Design a protein around this nucleic acid. Structure first.
Lengths: 72, 72
DNA sequence: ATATGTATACCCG
DNA sequence: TCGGGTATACATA
């Protein structure tokens, strides 16, 4: 069975992504994997680099369709 | 009073995020405002699939809460 | 159940 | 009591 995950926004900043054409269906799972891969409980850190690279695969589904988007 | 935004996934990386310590509330919306503002060219990262062991050589991206984005 | 989603009762802290 | 979160009932396509 699938798991319905809900972030009760209306305050944070969710409406925008969906306001354009993508709530979190593919967003969440995408961001999660990145937050998952990196997952390293910590704090006090700055940034200054880009994040590219691709590695898509056809077998599951990944139905993330919106603003002319597609898998990596 | 708050907007329920939910992605009916399960293991689409979603579960991992909350599985570590954050039911995407701040992550999604954080990610949202970013993909919301940028709304063009997402940001990913993949060096090594965790593996328990880490290293951390420099700075790349910040997350807060209890996850962060280190290099490894 | 159709998935994805909202709405709401219950749920986890 | 709910912060939010998810599940299920229900809503929609």
């Amino acid at each position: 069975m699938k798991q319905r995950i809900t972030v009760t926004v209306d305050s944070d900043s969710y409406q925008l992504l969906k306001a354009y054409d993508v709530n979190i269906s593919g967003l969440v799972s995408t961001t999660m994997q990145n937050e998952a891969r990196r997952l390293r409980a910590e704090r006090w850190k700055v940034e200054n680099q880009e994040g590219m690279v691709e590695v898509a695969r056809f077998i599951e589904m990944n139905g993330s369709f919106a603003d002319e988007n597609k898998d990596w």
